DNA sequence: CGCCGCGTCAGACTCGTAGGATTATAGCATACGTGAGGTGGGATGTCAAGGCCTTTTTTGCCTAAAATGTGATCTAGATCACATTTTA
């Protein structure tokens, strides 16, 4: 599943990688919301996969940028 | 053996001049801890009157005793117009 969507993962992280913080780390961050996704997932739902670890690579990225990517620590509500 | 290609590595010295950055990234719910706020409470620090001792300020006082007064009786100084008289 995993080694499957890593396009999908990188995909997405290039949305991302305007300059940021770095190419590689959207990236990795992007696979840990897809291992995510990939223990979480129903086929139940019967819904495509994409969208489901879309969303929670997504979060994954979108919160990793925040925690780190400065020198000084703002955290997420500012 | 002797190229050839690629890569590594230095490029003088002291002063002065200016301020200075930027993109876009979801959203709400749970639940937990730490910062700025209260709060009585030991405990410390202050400020105004009183009891121990010595010193200081009044102040007794203690007797040597030298000093302070009594006043009629004197005394040895002190004068002034005339008559010379001396000395530089």
């Known amino acids: 599943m995993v080694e ?7 995909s997405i992280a290039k949305k991302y990688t ?6 590689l780390d959207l990236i990795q961050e992007g ?6 996704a990939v223990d979480k997932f129903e086929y139940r739902r019967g819904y495509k996969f994409s969208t ?9 990225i979108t919160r ?5 990517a400065r020198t000084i620590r703002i955290p997420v509500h500012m």
């Open 31 to 36: 696979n840990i919301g897809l291992m995510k």
């Open 64 to 68: 990793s940028i925040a925690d780190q």
């Open 4 to 10: 499957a969507n890593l396009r999908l993962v990188i």
């Open 18 to 23: 305007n300059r940021g913080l770095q190419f």
């Open 52 to 60: 489901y670890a879309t969303w929670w690579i997504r979060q994954a």
